[PDB]
Design a protein around this ligand. Sequence first.
Ligand SMILES: *[C@H](C)[C@H]1/C(=C/c2[nH]c(/C=C3N=C(/C=C4\NC(=O)C(CC)=C4C)C(C)=C\3CCC(=O)O)c(CCC(=O)O)c2C)NC(=O)[C@@H]1C
Ligand SMILES: *[C@H](C)[C@H]1/C(=C/c2[nH]c(/C=C3N=C(/C=C4\NC(=O)C(CC)=C4C)C(C)=C\3CCC(=O)O)c(CCC(=O)O)c2C)NC(=O)[C@@H]1C
Ligand SMILES: *[C@H](C)[C@H]1/C(=C/c2[nH]c(/C=C3N=C(/C=C4\NC(=O)C(CC)=C4C)C(C)=C\3CCC(=O)O)c(CCC(=O)O)c2C)NC(=O)[C@@H]1C
Ligand SMILES: *[C@H](C)[C@H]1/C(=C/c2[nH]c(/C=C3N=C(/C=C4\NC(=O)C(CC)=C4C)C(C)=C\3CCC(=O)O)c(CCC(=O)O)c2C)NC(=O)[C@@H]1C
Ligand SMILES: *[C@H](C)[C@H]1/C(=C/c2[nH]c(/C=C3N=C(/C=C4\NC(=O)C(CC)=C4C)C(C)=C\3CCC(=O)O)c(CCC(=O)O)c2C)NC(=O)[C@@H]1C
Ligand SMILES: *[C@H](C)[C@H]1/C(=C/c2[nH]c(/C=C3N=C(/C=C4\NC(=O)C(CC)=C4C)C(C)=C\3CCC(=O)O)c(CCC(=O)O)c2C)NC(=O)[C@@H]1C
Ligand SMILES: *[C@H](C)[C@H]1/C(=C/c2[nH]c(/C=C3N=C(/C=C4\NC(=O)C(CC)=C4C)C(C)=C\3CCC(=O)O)c(CCC(=O)O)c2C)NC(=O)[C@@H]1C
Ligand SMILES: *[C@H](C)[C@H]1/C(=C/c2[nH]c(/C=C3N=C(/C=C4\NC(=O)C(CC)=C4C)C(C)=C\3CCC(=O)O)c(CCC(=O)O)c2C)NC(=O)[C@@H]1C
Ligand SMILES: *[C@H](C)[C@H]1/C(=C/c2[nH]c(/C=C3N=C(/C=C4\NC(=O)C(CC)=C4C)C(C)=C\3CCC(=O)O)c(CCC(=O)O)c2C)NC(=O)[C@@H]1C
Lengths: 161, 161, 161, 161, 161, 66, 221, 50, 160, 160, 160
Amino acid sequence: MQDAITAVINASDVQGKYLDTAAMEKLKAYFATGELRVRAASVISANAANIVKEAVAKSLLYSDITRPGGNMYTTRRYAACIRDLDYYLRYATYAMLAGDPSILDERVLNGLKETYNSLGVPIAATVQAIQAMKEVTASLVGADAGKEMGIYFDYICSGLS
Amino acid sequence: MQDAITAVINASDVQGKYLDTAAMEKLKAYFATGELRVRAASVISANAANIVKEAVAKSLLYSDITRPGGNMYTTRRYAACIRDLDYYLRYATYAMLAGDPSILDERVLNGLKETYNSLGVPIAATVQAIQAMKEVTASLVGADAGKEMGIYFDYICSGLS
Amino acid sequence: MQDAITAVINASDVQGKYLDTAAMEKLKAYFATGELRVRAASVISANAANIVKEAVAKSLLYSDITRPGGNMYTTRRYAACIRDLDYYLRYATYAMLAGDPSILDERVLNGLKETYNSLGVPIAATVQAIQAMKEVTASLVGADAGKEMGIYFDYICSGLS
Amino acid sequence: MQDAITAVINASDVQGKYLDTAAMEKLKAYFATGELRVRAASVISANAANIVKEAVAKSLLYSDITRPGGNMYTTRRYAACIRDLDYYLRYATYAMLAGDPSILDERVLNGLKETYNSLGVPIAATVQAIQAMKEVTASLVGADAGKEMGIYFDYICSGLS
Amino acid sequence: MQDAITAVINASDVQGKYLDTAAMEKLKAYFATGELRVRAASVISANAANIVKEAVAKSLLYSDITRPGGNMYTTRRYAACIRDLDYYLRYATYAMLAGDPSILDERVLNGLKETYNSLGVPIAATVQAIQAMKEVTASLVGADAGKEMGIYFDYICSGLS
Amino acid sequence: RMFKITACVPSQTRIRTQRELQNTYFTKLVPYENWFREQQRIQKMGGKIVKVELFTGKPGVNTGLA
Amino acid sequence: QPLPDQHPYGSGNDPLEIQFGAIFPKEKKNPSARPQPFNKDTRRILIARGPGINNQVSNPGARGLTPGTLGPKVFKLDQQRVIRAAYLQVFGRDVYEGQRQKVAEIKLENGEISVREFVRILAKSNLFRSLYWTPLYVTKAIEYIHRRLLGRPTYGRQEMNAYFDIASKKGLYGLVDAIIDSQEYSEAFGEDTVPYERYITPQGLALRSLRVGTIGETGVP
Amino acid sequence: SRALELAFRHILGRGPSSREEVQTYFAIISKGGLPALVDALVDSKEYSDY
Amino acid sequence: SVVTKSIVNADAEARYLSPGELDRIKNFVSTGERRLRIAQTLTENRERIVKQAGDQLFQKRPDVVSPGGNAYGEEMTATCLRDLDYYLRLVTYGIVAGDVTPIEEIGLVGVREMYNSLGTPIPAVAEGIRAMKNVACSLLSAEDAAEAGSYFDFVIGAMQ
Amino acid sequence: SVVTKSIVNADAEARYLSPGELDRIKNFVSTGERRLRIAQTLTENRERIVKQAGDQLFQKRPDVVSPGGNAYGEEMTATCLRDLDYYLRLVTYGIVAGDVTPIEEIGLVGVREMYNSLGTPIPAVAEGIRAMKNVACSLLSAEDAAEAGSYFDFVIGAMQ
Amino acid sequence: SVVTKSIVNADAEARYLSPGELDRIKNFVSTGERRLRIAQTLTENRERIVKQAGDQLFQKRPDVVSPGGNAYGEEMTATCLRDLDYYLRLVTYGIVAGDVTPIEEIGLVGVREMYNSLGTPIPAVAEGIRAMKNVACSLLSAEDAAEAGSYFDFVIGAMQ
Ligand SMILES: *[C@H](C)[C@H]1/C(=C/c2[nH]c(/C=C3N=C(/C=C4\NC(=O)C(CC)=C4C)C(C)=C\3CCC(=O)O)c(CCC(=O)O)c2C)NC(=O)[C@@H]1C
Ligand SMILES: *[C@H](C)[C@H]1/C(=C/c2[nH]c(/C=C3N=C(/C=C4\NC(=O)C(CC)=C4C)C(C)=C\3CCC(=O)O)c(CCC(=O)O)c2C)NC(=O)[C@@H]1C
Ligand SMILES: *[C@H](C)[C@H]1/C(=C/c2[nH]c(/C=C3N=C(/C=C4\NC(=O)C(CC)=C4C)C(C)=C\3CCC(=O)O)c(CCC(=O)O)c2C)NC(=O)[C@@H]1C
Ligand SMILES: *[C@H](C)[C@H]1/C(=C/c2[nH]c(/C=C3N=C(/C=C4\NC(=O)C(CC)=C4C)C(C)=C\3CCC(=O)O)c(CCC(=O)O)c2C)NC(=O)[C@@H]1C
Ligand SMILES: *[C@H](C)[C@H]1/C(=C/c2[nH]c(/C=C3N=C(/C=C4\NC(=O)C(CC)=C4C)C(C)=C\3CCC(=O)O)c(CCC(=O)O)c2C)NC(=O)[C@@H]1C
Ligand SMILES: *[C@H](C)[C@H]1/C(=C/c2[nH]c(/C=C3N=C(/C=C4\NC(=O)C(CC)=C4C)C(C)=C\3CCC(=O)O)c(CCC(=O)O)c2C)NC(=O)[C@@H]1C
Ligand SMILES: *[C@H](C)[C@H]1/C(=C/c2[nH]c(/C=C3N=C(/C=C4\NC(=O)C(CC)=C4C)C(C)=C\3CCC(=O)O)c(CCC(=O)O)c2C)NC(=O)[C@@H]1C
Ligand SMILES: *[C@H](C)[C@H]1/C(=C/c2[nH]c(/C=C3N=C(/C=C4\NC(=O)C(CC)=C4C)C(C)=C\3CCC(=O)O)c(CCC(=O)O)c2C)NC(=O)[C@@H]1C
Ligand SMILES: *[C@H](C)[C@H]1/C(=C/c2[nH]c(/C=C3N=C(/C=C4\NC(=O)C(CC)=C4C)C(C)=C\3CCC(=O)O)c(CCC(=O)O)c2C)NC(=O)[C@@H]1C
């Protein structure tokens, strides 16, 4: 649970040094991008359900995954899958606000692959859906903030894979 | 492993459509920068050793990391650390040539957090070193190649984080 | 707990097709064996205490196990052992009614070896006592049900070993 | 592996300090214990098979472990168990010679608990067996080095637990 | 939790023997030395803060562990260390009163090495601190009960090692 | 808004030795949000609260009541 | 072999059954994972920290019969130290001096609030959140909270998914109230008793009971 | 056991395929150690064939 | 024991033994010598107590020893008298330990289940233990007999 | 930081960050330039702040430097000044973060426990931090000192 | 208000208002004039915003006014427009407050349940409020409209 500001100061703290000028430059960078990050976060908040719905339609619906015997087929499984996509999008938004994928590490990816492998969830199909969510999010929040959201979606994909 | 051409062709192939004009534009951009990519790659190959030397001197050297018990103390550990910086540079060069980050995800980032967390390697210090390598490399190869190589260095940095 | 009917309908559901005539044949078969299964379950329920009393007397009583230091010595441990024999009988009866070993797999045998090995319970003696219960049960419900109660009791013994 | 010498020097190396006078006292103590340790190692080396024989008799044999379905039943498994007990004896004697339990931690304990739980090996019986080995070894090598062997035998018990 | 008195009676129970002359001699010894044990427990109870203070001073303060980049650095971490040192002292006093290390095994050492390896706590430094407490409490409670305490403090040290 | 009510909860007959006086007569403070659960528990007990009052002065504010 | 005793989601979701700490295996630090496929409604075999005759699987009625000398101490409030016990059970350690909720949440001494509500206050407090919700992957946190608030490790996926939908839609506060409002918290621990450890997984009993000094005779005649 | 699995990777270019393989070569590494396991894996027909 | 009772209560609250707890331990260790003596009389006379109490039980509850009863024949009457010996042994453990926890752990948690599985009549077992209590009181001095009688009383209460 | 506190509350309530919390983050990122400037002045003058405030602490509380006090002798006084330097470093961190949680995480949680163990008097340490606040206020402009003083005030309040 | 929410939250922890919360209420005080100005201009256009946004809602979703839609008939169309007006009234309250506490309590908690009982489609309500957000943004000053859009975003996000 480190944001960019906390990460900068934490590294300084471990070294035992007052904030250096280079660290000030890194903090300035976070403050500089803050406005676009906050704006995109509010946009995702408003369109949260739609982002997930579009991603499911773009990557998962009318496919082997949702047709009978595909592990998203039963209604309980469909509800579970969209719940997980909601979880991914919410923590990606938190990560964009903070500037750090550490929240994704601690709250999503610390045991996710083992749970998915045990349950039988197809990792590749989830990765496809998360990638589609990246495309939809980029359109909704704008390309400039879309690059920022993209890195955190990629973090989820790298950990999940 | 996928280069940009492989990704474009495969996306078109899944859809079933012949290569569309927008896809042609993406491929055309990659081909157009081909001369710059090859030129920069040769520069990296020639200057790779000094790129690493400068980057280690910039951040890791004369630091707590090289102090006794700092995890680059031992001569073993120092040699391995500069090797890993060589790895990141080499695979960043591969990623630049291909134009896609799949090399980084397939070979560099499918065991990186496991290896580094198991060894105790300090991720923050590695991130600082790779950022320093990005700056040194950008100076040697010029701004256009500094931007391209920079995105792949950033990929490795965020993945390590 | 999947039974024969639930398993048949589930398999047809996975394929996606409505219930086939062949599936109807299988369901008719289970309905045919319903009379023996229900009758045997009623017999087991009424005589459950006597089944366990006879099995304990035949196999476990007046041995080292029931004498000081034998793991059935303490009054606590004796009551726990008879409770475990009741467990195996009850879930074997559930399995016979269902026509499916899924309940045994899911609830009874999962981690049974690990719990017993952690507690110090002799798994060899538990297997022998379950065999004694199998013989007593076979006598009480007759060869028709004893054949089936045999397969479910032996399922427990195979897993427990 | 770290023996006592290597542990002392590595502890000093981590701080970065030359070997202190207190560290010299530690090393001198190890050198003082050297004769009794080497003598005891030769005793165990010649009497290794007898130690395993006596221990398996004292604890493992004539129990539910060796009755059919008890995990040590079958000649394959009885051979395997005596092989594992000799593993413990050999590494424990290595540890007596070196003076540090790092051999046990590196070559025995790490991962053994998971493999044993996977294979179904009773873990209580293993602990009781190696404690029985401790009793036999104390008799053969004498009390003073039996004091020493016990430390490493107990280390193995704690790791398996 | 099992005293020496409960241990004696439980051993006789396992053998199915009434308390014999030898075990009754064991009990007579414990009852006789109980007065010394009780008084020492009162002494450690009153001087718990002082014992922990002096031990932290003798082995842990003014060193790498307390300086930035060490474990005890940050008030959070330092408070945790003194808390754990008091836990080791309090449970050692429980064990002295009882006459058995079982309280330490069940409540303290039941995973301690794994927890400290998970958090990165230095096992060697913890051992040094506990041995420092051993010295200080020996001074406070006197030599006669200091030896009786020392065996249980050494038990904790061995477990954490 | 927390509602405080006194209930002589009907005897559950769950006391052998032990003690049931504290359960038998209850004066408690209950949040208005959690008062529904309290009413359900009173139904299980079998005794309605003899007296019911609400600490907050006004029962309803359509907006910003909190 | 048949299925193991691990949490259905994975081996990593099993905390060390220690006094306090929430020490879960990390998926990446030292790679170790045994993903075994667990069905929708399996049930863990939970050893009872008490007498095995009193087990919720076999004696479902006798939830609330005290563990006795064979189990943990059971603190019940009569009308003191229940407050201390509630801290030592909801968190595990006695909390630091500034971290005490103090009389602001301790109206229990006055009698305004029952012990069920006191543990709900402590469970929703910011200290508890920071310790056992913020730094832990979700299902690992759901498990640890279930073990701290209810006495027992989670049985299976029937419970994890039901306590996971609640968490996804309401967070730590919703999950905490679901656990504390559950029928099992009222059946065992009632509304007057501090929660206590009622069950342990077999590899928690392995850690406690098979070290030299606790194994005694357990394992061979 | 882990040493055996790593040895299969390095010297034979694959991982153990069955319990019979693990039983066989765990016995080998038990009876002769690393020199024995190295000899067994290189001697194996599988090495010569591939 | 009493040491364990004190330590368990202290451990739950994470506090060193309170002065009152330590007072109880000091009393118990000071009284230990007389406790061991009382237990020793019971162990030394272990045959008399069982034999005479067995006769009293069989007189008062003749149905158990009659043909068709649980303890019919010397083969099964031997097992009944053995159980009476078991409970005398548990009582001696309790006298030494100073608590009923030894008795309750070894032989009172689940007696209803165990004996109801063996078919034995538990009220008759209770009569047997009461007979042992009376016989033991004959052997012991009045002050000591009161202390040992408490442990016998716990056993009979548990089996009622 | 404001961002991390907002995320923590939203995470614990399963809530995309509320508009008000987003507004708080917006104001904080804008004031970033002023925040970093204030931190730069404080770290540049850290030597003067610690020295002057340490003199004030010893003058106001002679007992801490008197015999029997915690900071008696040159080395003990040096460690006391180092602690004051630590707390100033924490205050600079807090100013940059815009939240007191970096100060709380590092050095303020369990401070009573740590200093009670060390033998240090907590209110006396609070006097030292109060003196540091006065010196920093002299080195800062009025608008700057009000914001930085609030972080000093939290430190003294928690360590009161 | 932000002050009221902050005071209640601090009361729960029994803490005097922390420096960050003091800063937040300080900024609320500072921006009060802009808040009142935004409320006044939106109130001036209150009828216009609702009516034209309602037209946009109907235009985007023809099923709303088609047979089988809840807003069928002129009276039901009036009720739908009234709901848009209700939310605008709450949004202006919330803009004045600086906090979503009014918006939440008055008209958002249980909105799914209320509209489910009525038969109304909450997703259709969401599209209508989105149209209101755009219309209000155009009428409001662009810099001020950025802040108001966040509060409209909260309302539409809660709808589902
Ligand atoms: C018909 C009464 C209403 C309606 C439906 C509608 N459905 C879809 C698409 C899907 N429906 C499902 C539902 C199920 N999957 C299941 O496994 C089960 C139970 C066995 C159910 C009920 C799913 C999974 C999909 C999508 C993926 C798929 O290929 O099945 C749509 C299309 C959604 C879209 O935008 O693409 C629609 C419109 N429409 C109506 O008007 C009725 C009120
Ligand atoms: C959706 C893109 C894909 C998919 C997923 C799917 N997941 C589940 C069930 C679970 N998912 C999780 C995941 C998480 N837990 C977390 O804490 C986090 C981080 C916040 C995540 C991502 C968990 C724990 C479960 C278990 C709950 C349970 O008991 O099921 C299912 C349900 C499986 C079932 O049988 O019910 C599914 C289907 N499925 C797909 O087809 C997509 C490709
Ligand atoms: C001296 C005889 C020759 C020489 C050496 C020289 N070395 C450095 C810098 C470093 N040297 C080390 C060496 C070690 N690190 C280790 O862990 C060990 C084993 C315990 C050794 C030997 C390191 C780490 C550094 C980097 C700085 C640091 O310690 O952090 C320099 C400075 C290089 C520079 O310009 O940066 C020099 C000059 N130089 C000579 O002329 C001799 C022939
Ligand atoms: C340097 C910036 C930091 C650092 C590094 C360090 N690394 C190692 C050891 C390993 N590094 C790797 C990583 C890779 N292996 C790969 O094949 C690739 C490319 C695909 C990468 C990135 C691995 C596998 C190891 C371990 C095996 C080995 O020794 O090579 C060490 C050694 C640790 C040890 O003692 O065992 C170190 C010290 N150290 C630093 O201080 C920097 C911050
Ligand atoms: C005698 C007063 C009454 C009675 C008893 C009776 N008991 C048995 C058989 C068993 N009794 C036990 C009891 C214990 N096991 C323990 O560990 C302890 C505590 C230390 C006790 C009390 C057990 C285990 C058995 C089983 C046989 C065995 O020991 O292996 C019998 C024999 C019953 C049979 O049919 O086998 C009898 C007769 N009978 C009476 O009439 C009295 C009222
Ligand atoms: C008899 C022909 C010869 C002989 C044998 C002898 N054996 C033992 C003890 C044991 N024998 C076994 C054997 C097996 N275990 C198995 O799983 C299988 C295959 C299914 C076999 C054959 C075992 C396990 C034991 C140990 C005791 C036990 O069973 O638990 C003894 C006793 C040895 C002792 O002193 O303890 C003897 C004497 N002895 C002869 O003289 C014959 C030539
Ligand atoms: C000065 C204002 C007062 C005072 C203090 C005093 N402190 C110590 C010793 C230590 N102080 C610390 C403090 C911290 N450790 C941390 O990690 C942090 C947060 C980052 C803080 C604030 C520590 C660790 C020590 C121990 C020594 C060490 O640093 O290793 C002393 C020395 C006491 C002794 O004998 O050990 C003193 C005197 N004394 C005063 O008079 C002031 C009122
Ligand atoms: C002090 C001598 C050394 C030290 C220790 C240290 N420990 C922790 C944190 C924890 N300690 C435990 C340990 C126990 N749990 C138990 O049940 C028992 C026995 C009753 C013990 C000993 C646990 C579980 C934790 C983690 C949870 C927690 O913080 O309490 C820390 C803090 C580490 C952190 O990340 O917060 C420290 C620093 N550190 C030292 O420097 C000494 C050498
Ligand atoms: C009887 C044939 C043998 C025997 C058994 C014995 N078992 C236990 C204790 C436990 N057994 C279980 C097993 C289960 N738990 C379940 O929920 C189910 C249903 C699927 C099963 C099969 C468990 C969990 C325990 C632990 C205590 C408990 O029930 O909670 C004991 C008690 C051990 C103790 O020391 O308390 C005993 C004695 N013992 C024998 O001698 C027979 C060979």
